[PDB]
Structure formats: structure tokens, C-alpha cells
């Protein structure tokens, strides 16, 4: 506990640097582990930036909103995190330094507090004052050092315990004459003396690493799990797409592939069909078919009803009287050979439901020469004669897949990035019926950029800030990748079909919180 | 320097345990780095297996053949290797323990020696006796501890220096009454006291890790970069394929994709064609075409002449008078739409050369309705009416690609594993000309299993021993993966088209040398 | 001695009570329950021989005592006894795995844990210390515990004729061992000793032919797997598949006829079995009534061998005229029927009605084999909880309970004749009740002795809690018989990799 | 409790000769019989073969089979048995010597154990390890 005051250059203010210990530390004797493992003395003298330990306070920030929330653990931040790969347990507190870029001609106050394990974090500075806390004034604060203790009832920690937290929040709002003034808060940390490790297990967990390295693979060498035969030619942002109900190209951390997705989408995954004789009332040639379903054929209401990865489609509404999908269909299976052509098709049309929700996924193919109990090969993709770029974007409604992929939306102020590609039209000049039209297809994350994430891993409760480098010029853009997971970037303006090349590459930047505001804007005005 | 003798149970022999220092260690004062970083005392007491530090001696092993060759570095073996990710330099020697499973009723002798930097390793025990060396007898040896020093002319090491080596070789051949007797040699190591690190750079190199974790992704969820639209359904071994001249599906460590390969092979990569009017003398309808070549169009004799990844083919010989490839061809580009059908095609046919070696890669399509200066879309794949499984295996001869992929062969006693899939026939019942036949297509490593290797890395000069687990039973097989790279497994017998399911998964086992003999055999008799 | 990890002694505060053991349990070493092994020249490097949790079950007396206690700590001292010989060579690893860390599957990674290397030449009476690793004052039941793992480092080789090596472990608690009380003597721990009441196999029911007694206990090496669905019982789950617990009462069934016939011979018509649990509302439940023989008819027909059943028609109070009919299962449908467990069957009876109900009782087969055509159950496609297909380890063979089914012959109108057959089954429910009451040590197998001729030298079998028993054999594979007048007395607990010393010569 | 090791002729093995007391002896004061009758000192120095005290182990012998089972009494073996004709009671323990014809080029192990009165004898070496052995 101490305080230093310094005079600023050209004396018109002061800077305060304080050391405080709101809660006394209870040092454990470590008598139940006579295998105490010592660290490298220099590791105690290197303060490093905390992942997700940066925030900005503007005049619009409310008190009671939680700006920072961090657990006390070896994950603070760089060298204890790397060292906690060879060991099974740990015990000890941390020195946390809070750096504030204040000025003598502003006003306002911060509050920081320590919260024990299994206690909920409130949303009120009034309530935070009931914890062990410290207050800062923006006119004089430079750095505050907090001796954050290790609150535990055990001799030492294994993995999976509940840990205490440091919470930082605005106590009194910021004011200034200039409307563009903001205060940046940053956090660094180091282990206190008496921090120790326990039993040395040089066998390393494959998810035992801080910052991960992304290989330099440009987007143009990637699927595109919704149009595999076509390559990715650009990224693009559109303001009108505030949701995504796709079932393909949905990959997440902690689960792998979700929805009706797979890691091998090569080609518009083919399928086979066979079902009753019967046609749609809207045309006597719109015959019925049922998708052949391996992989738990028995129609369990909990297993997916469509073949894994086949779900290549557009939409979808009863206006389908003038809109259809286009597929290469082989009309019979005959000792391997199949008579193939192109045909129109779509998901079931029974206005009882505006059918995008077929359970067994009944389809029709618009073919009068179709048999009833024969098997027909079906391979997407095409559309005609619809608008139709915006119709392909909206996927068929899904409740057949019981463990289906949920709809997702970006937070206010952000938009998706939508890996984009083009597919052309297959025109016919001889016989009527089958003429498609060109269309662009978008898609969320692809398996290529996620395999590295699966190998490395993500810290619990944090997203990845990545830099997209596209030289030839000297341009770097910033994206936020969530483990749900998908990419967003901080747009400002109205839709212009914003386009971004696909020859750059992704390089890892710091970890951040889901509410982090990117310090880089894309102007959707062009 | 010391020696202990112990009596075996039921005294009929002895075991000797010795400590020797063939070369004195010169401890450096480290005066040019006043930033000395200490290790964890328990790291000095844990001896761990050395990667590539196991060998077997049988009665067939010659003296002079080099069994073990290892550099003295932090890569010995587990905890110094992991710790040498946060640091920039190191200095100190290693204790190397050599464990021998001998018996009192055998005969023979081993020799171990220390070799300074920039000296070539000879292939003669007679010459090894000129180095600092130690000798062992198989009747009494149990463990030999060698104080291997750090031979350097610098105060401490940065990365990239040349290091001394330990070499182990047979001195006098092994004999025994039983013909099945072998002696296994194993190596463990630990850092000596006075081993130290230098400047702490907690920034971690992404290739700064020992053992790597492979995600549990079964082969059936993988391309297949030579038949992407079809999934991988099995692995298989054939004795008749002792070479591979493929240009697709060739991925290597230290380079990425080589040959005419790419990381996004989805679909049989399409292309476009246009060239002079002219036909083959063997038929007036075999028109000529030239593959459109983006990506350095100007025909530089050093750039590849085929589009990246398009090289989907079979073969290939003048018997092509009765053999052709089958492709979906769109006969014109008209505002996006294209009139599409199926056609026969192949690489240029000018018996001047048995043309598999076209420079600009001239092709023919067997279409009388073809224009001269129009552009035609081409998409593989099929074959007819050839044998033809063995013809697709042999790729067209390649000298057009200047930096082309070299031919590779397995070492004696091993065979490839050949990711395998099937593609069916597209039959026609109306018009003559186009009927394909079913065929199986093989391929070497796929990008899916190599991305993890790229992220993790390989130790210099070593291969990866992997275990293929296929339960439902309790079966585990063993494969050797080379970074060239490809998989081999220790076969014994004659070809039977050996088949292995594709539902298991790969789990990492120790690192080994390219000459390592797998202790698991596959019987190609069935 | 050797101690890879130091034992940290706990001061038991505040355990409500500190309960001492009598001083004589510390001074005598007993066998470790389940710590027995064989190493042969065929064992591969990296094979995990021993995996043993460090708990009160490492000693014979502490495990008995650890049934009236609620907590304990700490460690043990183990002694390795090796029955080696003059000509062998090889090495083992012994490693201590802390919680909650996973056991690796390679010897290269075991190094890295605290460990010891043991050579077959000098590891003849060797002392190791298994410590109790914890961050608490004492253990409650259900806690995560550390492990001792023994794996092959350098394979076994010899300079002369090849001998096998048998290894055993004895243990004693360390002086700092204590319990924490008090609870009644039923506390979920497997007893170190299993007491089997004497009951000959002939007094046991055969679950795949309830009305025929068991005559043997025969072995056949051509049967490398078992996909049956009836004679399946385990220790943890009890009866699995479509198994009771009562072969007899669950034998008969009823079906509802359907309007239809098979193309081959229209004289036989379809029918759907009745499921009183109605698991057609749910595909996650069995599609066949509990019981209901899982025979046993191979490729379909053309030579149209079928099954045989006593069948009748339902009327008030019972069933009218009953005959013998042929019913196996649908002929050539897509699911392999007649090679799949299904609700759908057919019967050879032109006089069948449409919506009537018919009683069915399987009784025999016709035109079939007295051998592996009925030994193979049809199939278990679907999403319900069917019994998995199992196989014995290399070098081991199954032991089956066997019965003889006599043939029913006719002379007048039916022209339906059965063939004398032999039906074999896995474990019978009457040999598992005491096991269920007593329990098995985690990951261990029961070595049992079959006593045959008043106490002569006699057979040894392995019993696996997955519900099946095996024997070690050598030679030909012609059906080998064993009488059914034994006792099945308990010998010990062994690891699943143990290889039985007694060998059955299948040559006779 | 002691152990001697000797080297065999043409040294290719060893022979071990041990003395062990698995259970301590409780010597009785004999205060309820003030008529204590002494034996002949030389009877304490003559070890004689036990009736039914020979067995053969072959490669076909199983563990758990009981090879020897003998009660501790004057019937061990020759002179106390003859002397226990003139007397009405007795008390005291016995020295039992187990001679094994082993060889340095074999393998295997024996177990011997002491079993108190009114306790059943089990048929498992695993269970025998619970006795003084």
C-alpha cells in the first residue's frame, strides 16, 4: 500500500501511481503437495498485456455497465499460461496493473473491485461499493497496482475450479469540452512471489497454448461449403442481411460441425431419391420423391432427416410457381451407369405448409417419365427464373432436424462478411424446360480457416480479433471471429454490396470480449 | 565415471550399470548474457524417451551400419523442448542413458561415440574407434550413462547452429542359439546441471512444440483430391504399385502444395479451352483444343502449363485408340449460360511423342460440331472402355511443369496406403458415343490430415509413427507418415487388394527415423 | 525401494473421527486383487497390462474394511514378485498418473510422468511406493484418484525355448493410512472375494431354448463372434438387448395378420408382431417383444429352409386349432429380411385371415443345419439399444451352454417336418445373480475353476462382466464337449490381458 | 529368522536355506499341570520324515490345488508319536523342514501357510496370501 505523485511536464497537473491490496492474501503452506515446482525469477518481473484487457470510455458510457471481468488464473497472461501446460496444479495470486490515459482537464471516476468465487456480478456501481474496491479519478490517475489474491479453500488448484474475478466499471461519467475525448484503459499482469506450480506432467495437452498461428492461406483457396465446385472470389458485406438461418457451412468451437454440415463438402453433395407415385396439384408432371437416408435410416425424430451435407438449396416460397432449383438428375441406377440430364426440382409443395419444413424432406422433380419405386441420383445446383440473389440467401425453414443449427445475428453496429462466390447458368437451345440463370452464393465460415482454431483452441468466453492484410497496397482491415462461429466487422453506413478482395491473409491479433468495439471502420458509401 | 555390478535373480549372470564421460565438458561463464534464466529443479531429475531413440538389433544387422544419430540440443526430449519456446538461447550438456535388454547367453558388442560439429559420420566401427567412444557387451550391459557435452565456440546458442552428435552402431555382431532373438536399445535423456536458457521472449513461435495432437476426423470425411465429388470409402494396399508419378494430391512439409496441386480441390476442377482448327489423323472428328491458362498466362517454361488442380486424368497410352476420358463439356460461353453434354477427350495424340507430355497441354474432344476460336468449358471425370483400374493409377508423363512433383517410391518392405474411392458410370441409352464405366480412384495424402501437421510441424529429419484405431473391435494398426509426404506400412506377402475400413482415426505415436521398422505387420494373404 | 513421487502425509484435521486399523494389517503383505499378469513373446510394446487405481482396494483387508467407512487416506507400498527364468530379456514401465489427467496410449509419453523402468533380470522382488495424491484433507467416495500403470517397454525375448513370465503384486498400507467413519457395511464397494453357490450347469436355464435342459459346455473355434440378442446379461446394466431374466414366460408371442403375400410362394402371407410396449410410436425402443428367439436362418430361399412354430388363432378364452407352420421372416426385402430383427414376419398358411390375431411359439427349423446357420442371429439395424457384437481376445475361445432340440415329424396333411438341431447360448441368468449382489472390481475379470470329477485337475475359465466366458485352447477346432456337472468355484481376479496357464487340447 | 546362501558346484546358481516364524509362539506356563514330563534331549535333534509328507510338482499341476495339509501334533512324526502312548496330554510347537529339489534353469513358486483351528482351508493361492505364509 503506497502512493507516488509526480508533476507533469510544464506543470499543469499531477500523475498518481498507487499500490493497493483490497483483500489480504492467505498464503498456503502447500503441505499436501511435497512436489513444489519453482518458476524462473525473471517471469516475476515481466508484466504482459491481459487478453481481453483493453477498453475505451467515452461520454456515452453508463455507470453500472460492466467494462472488464477477468478471472484470477495462470491465463494472466503469457508466460504462466505457456508454463501451465507441463503442470497439473497451481496456487498463488497476481499483480494486476491498470494503466489509464487521463488528463487534467477532464472529469469522471472509475471503480475496480474483487469478487469472490460463486458470487454473481451486479450491474450497479452502488452495489460494487459493497465489495473490496478502489476508486480512480481521471484527472490524476496514471497506474494502479492491485495485489489480486487467490481465493481458494483447497491447498492448490486442479483444472476446473471456480475462481475469483476482477471487475472494472464506470463510477461517475466522463465529461470534457471536446466531444471526441475518450479514455483508454489497459491491463497488464504478472505472478506474485509465492506463485507456484505442482506435479510436473511434461505430457502436454494439445489445447495448452496462448496465441495461435494462422497459416497464410488466402480465402480464394477455400470452400465455400454451399457452392464447392465454384471457388471463393471475394468477401462482401451487405447491410440487409441481419440474420442467418443456414444449415450448411456452420462450424463451431466445442462441437465441430453442427446443423446438417460436414468437413468434406466437395461438390454439391449428391443424393438419391425414391418414393410414391403422386404429383402436385399445380402441375400433373411435378412427381413426388423422398430423399434416400443412410446414417440412421429409421426416421427417428431426433436424427437429421436430410443426408449429411446435401442441403444445397435456395428458396423456397409459394412464388415457386415461377421459381425452381435446377439439378443434374440421373434417372436410373443400372449396374453403375445412369442416364443423366438436367431438371427442375424443389422441396415439397403442400400449401398446408409453405413447405420449407418437410420432415422426411419430400421433393418433386418435374419429370413425367419418372417411375415410382426406382432410385434417381440428384446433384445440385441452379436456380431459375427468379430474382434471385436474395432468395438463395434465405434458407428453408428447419424443424425436421431436431438438433438443427439456430439462427444467429450480429450485435448492433456490426455486419457479417459472407464468403462469396459465383455460379453461372447452364443454357439450353434445343428442348424446352431447363434454362438456369447466373447467381452469387454466400456462406459463413469454411472448414479451412477453422481447423487451425480446432487445433489451437479459444480461451473460454472470448473472441478472436484478426487482421486481414491485403498488400499490393498497404491495407489492413480488422475482423472479429466468434466461436459460434462467424466473422463481423464494425460497419457504418448503408448497404452498397461492399466488396473486398480474396488475396489477402489472416493474421492473429489479441483476444477480446464479444462486446469489444473494433478500432477500424469500413465506410459503406464507396 | 563409475561402475556398479549387480547379480541377477537366481544367479546366472550379472548386470553392469556404468557412468562415463568420453569428452570433458567446458562450462561457459555466460558473461555475454547477464540475463541467465534458471530451470525448475525437478526438470533435472526426469529422464524421458528421446524421439527416434529406439532400435532393434537382430542377427542380420551389420557392423558399420548407423543405428542411431542424434544431435545434442534442447530437443532432448520433452520438457526442455517445451521450455525452448519462450527463450532465445541456451547452453549446456545432456545426460544420455542407453538401456539395453541383454542376456547372459548371447554374444556381441555395441559401440557409442561422440562426434564434434562439422565432421562427417563414417560407416565403419573401425573408424568410429577414432572418436571418443565407449563399448558395451550384450551379456552384462543394463544401462550406460553418457555425459554428452555441449561442443561450441560461442558463449551461448541461438537457433540455426551446427551441433555435435551421438552415434550408436554395432561393433561385433549378435549371436544366439535361438534364431528369433533380438536386443532392443532405448535412449532417455535429461539436462545436466549448468544447463541454462537466455533472454525470455514469452512470444511463442507457432512451431515451438513437441508431440502434436491430430483431431479425431475419420478418413471418410476427407477428399480425395483426385475424385472430390466422390467420398473416401476405404484405405487399401496393393503390392504392384511401387511408384507414384501423380501431380495431384501431393502435399509436403516445408513447401505446402507441390506439383500441380492445391488445397481446394472441390469438384474435378473445371477449365476452359480454345485453340486452332485441326484434327487428329486417327479420326476426322478428334478436334484440337488448348487449355486456357490464367495464373501467369504467358507460357514461361518455368511456370506450370496446366491450370492449378485441373489435372484430373487417367492414362494415356496410344492404346487410347480404344481408351478415352469422359468429361462434361459446355460447348459455348453465352452470357453465363452454356449448352452442356458429355464427350470423350484425352491429352494430345501425336505419335511423335506417346503424348502424355504436352507443353501447352493440347487436348482433343471428339466433337465435329466444335468451333475454332470459341471457348468451351470442360469438367472431368470418367473413363471408357479400358480395363481400367490400373491405367488411371499411372499419371501422364510430366516435363511441362518445370517445378513438377518427383516420382516417389517406398523403402524395401513397405507399401503405400492409397486413400481410395469409387466413381460410377454415366450410361446413355439414346445416342451413340458416350458411355463410361465404373472405376476406383486412389490418391496420396489429402490436405485435411496435413493441415494439423503444418500447424504443429515436424522435427528435422524424422517421420511420424501413427496408430490407426478402428474399434467396434479392438484393432490398432501402425503407419509411418513421411513429410515428403505419404504413408507406408510394413507389408509381408503378395498383392490381394488389401482393404481397410475408413471409420477409424489417427492418433500420434512417437517420432522415428525413416529407416525405422514398424513392430506390426499386415498379412497380405487374407 | 523406489518412490517416483514423494508421499505427502496428511494431518487428518478436521475429519470428525480418525479411525485406526489394527497394527497387524500393516505388517503383512497380501495379494493385490486384480494385480496378476502374463508377458509372452507376442505382447506388443505399448500394451497397457496393469491399470490400477490407488485406493483402499489395493489390499485384501482394507477393501473389506472399506465397506463400513466413508473416507480414507493415503498411500500403499507394493511388492513385485516375478516368476522369471535364465533365458529371458525385456523391460516394463511403472508410472504414477495424477488426477484428473488422462492416461496416454504410447510408451513414449508415459516417460514424462514419474516412473520406474524394471528389467526382467533384476525385478524379482521389488518395492514401489504408490502415493495418495490429493489437494484435500481426505477422500470421500466417488472422488477422482491417481493411477498406477504398468506397460511393456521392451518386448520379451529369449535365447532358448520361449517361456512365459507371470507377475504378481502384493501390497500393504503405509503407516499413515487411516479411515473416516461411520456407515453400515453395505457401501457400494466390490468385495475382494466372490462367493458362488454350488449349482451345476444342467440346473441352469438355456435362454435360447427354454424347454430343453443344458447338457454341455462345448467349444468351437469357428465361432469367432456372437451377435445374439437373448442370452445377454452384464453386471452394470443387467439384461440387455431383448433379454430376460426369464426365457420361459417371454417365449410365446402374438401377431396380427396383414393383407398381402410374398412373390415367391403366395401361399405364405405377411404379419406384424404385437409389441405390448408399443415401441412403434418410438423408433428408439426395441421393435420385437422381449424374448422371442433370435434364430437363425441364413440366406433366404430357393432352397427354402424356414423356421417352425406352433401357431394358432385367437378366440374367446384362448386359441383355437393349433398346428405347426413355417414362418421365418420376409424373403428378399431391402433390409436383408430374412436377415434382420423386425416386426414383420410371414407364415406358410393360406387359411390366414386379415385382421385376426395369431399365437406363435418357435419350436424348430427345417431343411437347415445342426450348426452355424442358427448360431448367427439375423441383424439389429436401427437406433434402439441392441446388444453389440463381441469377440474373444486372440488365443481364447468362447464357452457355450448347449441343448438338443428334437425334431417334430408329420405324416398326414401338413408335410411340415423339423430337423434335430443343437442350440447354444452365452451366459445363463442363473450364474450372475450372486455377481450382481457382490460386484466386480473396476476393469477386472473373474478367473473361475470348473470342478468336474470330485476334485481332480480341472478346467479354468475367464468370466468377463460384459457377460461371457472364455477358455485358452490349442489345436484343431472340432466341436469339443465338456460335462455339465461342475461347481464354478471362484479363483481370483485377473486383468483382461491375463493368459490362463491351463490349456485345453482340442484334439482328443 | 535367518537366511544362508551357498554357491553350487561349478558356480551356475545358488541355494538358499531359510528359517522363518510366520506366527509368534505363545509358550504356556503349564500351571494347571504340576506334573510336567520331560523328553530325551536327543529327540529334539532328530528330524524324521512326516507321514504323508511327500509330493511331486509337474508342469500339469495347477495353483490352488492343495498338495499338503498336515495337523500340528505329536503325530509328527516318529518318536513323539511313539512317546505319546504313555501320556495323557501334551503342549508345544514343531520345527517343520521343507526340502525342495530345485534347479537354476526352471521357474515357478511355492506358497506355504499356517491355518488356525476351526477355519476352512481355501482352494486359492490368492486367498492363502491372507494367512501367515
From TrEMBL, chain D:
It is found in: Host cytoplasm; Virion. It comes from the Viruses. GO terms for cellular component: host cell cytoplasm; virion component. Keywords: Host cytoplasm, Virion. This is Capsid protein. It comes from Tulane virus. The chain holds residues 2 to 134 of 534 of the full protein.
Amino acid at each position: 500500500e503506497s502512493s507516488k505523485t509526480e508533476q507533469v511536464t510544464g506543470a499543469t497537473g499531477i500523475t498518481q501511481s498507487t499500490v493497493t491490496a483490497p483483500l489480504p492474501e492467505a498464503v498456503s503452506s502447500l503441505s499436501l503437495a511435497p512436489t513444489v515446482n519453482a518458476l524462473d525469477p525473471w517471469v516475476y518481473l515481466n508484466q504482459t498485456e491481459v487478453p481481453g484487457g483493453t477498453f475505451t470510455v467515452s461520454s456515452a458510457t453508463q455507470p453500472g455497465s460492466v467494462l472488464l471481468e477477468l478471472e484470477i488464473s495462470p491465463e494472466l497472461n503469457l508466460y504462466t499460461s505457456h508454463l501451465f501446460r507441463m503442470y497439473a496444479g497451481w496456487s498463488g495470486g497476481f499483480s494486476l496493473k491498470l494503466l489509464v490515459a487521463g488528463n487534467a482537464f477532464s472529469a469522471g471516476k472509475l471503480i475496480a473491485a474483487i469478487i469472490p468465487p460463486n458470487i454473481e456480478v451486479p450491474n450497479s456501481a452502488y452495489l460494487l461499493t459493497g465489495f473490496p474496491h478502489e476508486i480512480l479519478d481521471f484527472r490524476t490517475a496514471d497506474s494502479m497496482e492491485i495485489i489480486a489474491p487467490d481465493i481458494k479453500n483447497i491447498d492448490y488448484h486442479f483444472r476446473g475450479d471456480k475462481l475469483g474475478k476482477l471487475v472494472v466499471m464506470v463510477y461517475s461519467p466522463l465529461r470534457s469540452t471536446s466531444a471526441d475525448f475518450e479514455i483508454e484503459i489497459k491491463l497488464t499482469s504478472a505472478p506474485l512471489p509465492d506463485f507456484k506450480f505442482t506435479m510436473l506432467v511434461p505430457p502436454i495437452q494439445n489445447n495448452a497454448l496462448p496465441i495461435w498461428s494462422i497459416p497464410q492461406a488466402p480465402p480464394y483457396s477455400m470452400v465455400n461449403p454451399r457452392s464447392p465446385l465454384t471457388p471463393v472470389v471475394e468477401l462482401y458485406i451487405n447491410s440487409s442481411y441481419a440474420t442467418c438461418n443456414h444449415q450448411l457451412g456452420r462450424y463451431t468451437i466445442y462441437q465441430g460441425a453442427i446443423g446438417n454440415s460436414t468437413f468434406n463438402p466437395s461438390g454439391a453433395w449428391t443424393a438419391t431419391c425414391t418414393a410414391e407415385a403422386g404429383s402436385v396439384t399445380g402441375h400433373p408432371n411435378w412427381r413426388y420423391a423422398l430423399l434416400d437416408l443412410p446414417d440412421n435410416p429409421t426416421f427417428d425424430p431426433t436424427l437429421p432427416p436430410v443426408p449429411r451435407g446435401f442441403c444445397d438449396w435456395g428458396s423456397g416460397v409459394k412464388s415457386g410457381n415461377k421459381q425452381h432449383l435446377v439439378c443434374f438428375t440421373g434417372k436410373k441406377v443400372e449396374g453403375g451407369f445412369q442416364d443423366v440430364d438436367t431438371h427442375m426440382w424443389d422441396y415439397g409443395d403442400n400449401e398446408t405448409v409453405g413447405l420449407d419444413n418437410t420432415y422426411q424432406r419430400t421433393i418433386y422433380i418435374k419429370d413425367p417419365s419418372l417411375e415410382k419405386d426406382a432410385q434417381y441420383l440428384v446433384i445440385p445446383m441452379g436456380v431459375s427464373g427468379a430474382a434471385n440473389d436474395d432468395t438463395v440467401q434465405v434458407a428453408p425453414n428447419c424443424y425436421g432436424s431436431w438438433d438443427y443449427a439456430p439462427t444467429v445475428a450480429p450485435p448492433l453496429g456490426e455486419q457479417f462478411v459472407w464468403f462469396r462466390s459465383q455460379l453461372p447458368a447452364s443454357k439450353t437451345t434445343t428442348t424446352s424446360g431447363v434454362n438456369s440463370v447466373p447467381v452469387n452464393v454466400n456462406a459463413l465460415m469454411s472448414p479451412d480457416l477453422m481447423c487451425s482454431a480446432y487445433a489451437s483452441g479459444f480461451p473460454l468466453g472470448k473472441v478472436a480479433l484478426l487482421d486481414y492484410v491485403l498488400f499490393g497496397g498497404s491495407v489492413v482491415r480488422q475482423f472479429k471471429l466468434y466461436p459460434e462461429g462467424y466473422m463481423t466487422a464494425n460497419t457504418t453506413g448503408s448497404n452498397t454490396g461492399f466488396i473486398i478482395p480474396a488475396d489477402g491473409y489472416f493474421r492473429f491479433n489479441s483476444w477480446v470480449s464479444p462486446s469489444f468495439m473494433i478500432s477500424s471502420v469500413v465506410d459503406l458509401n464507396l
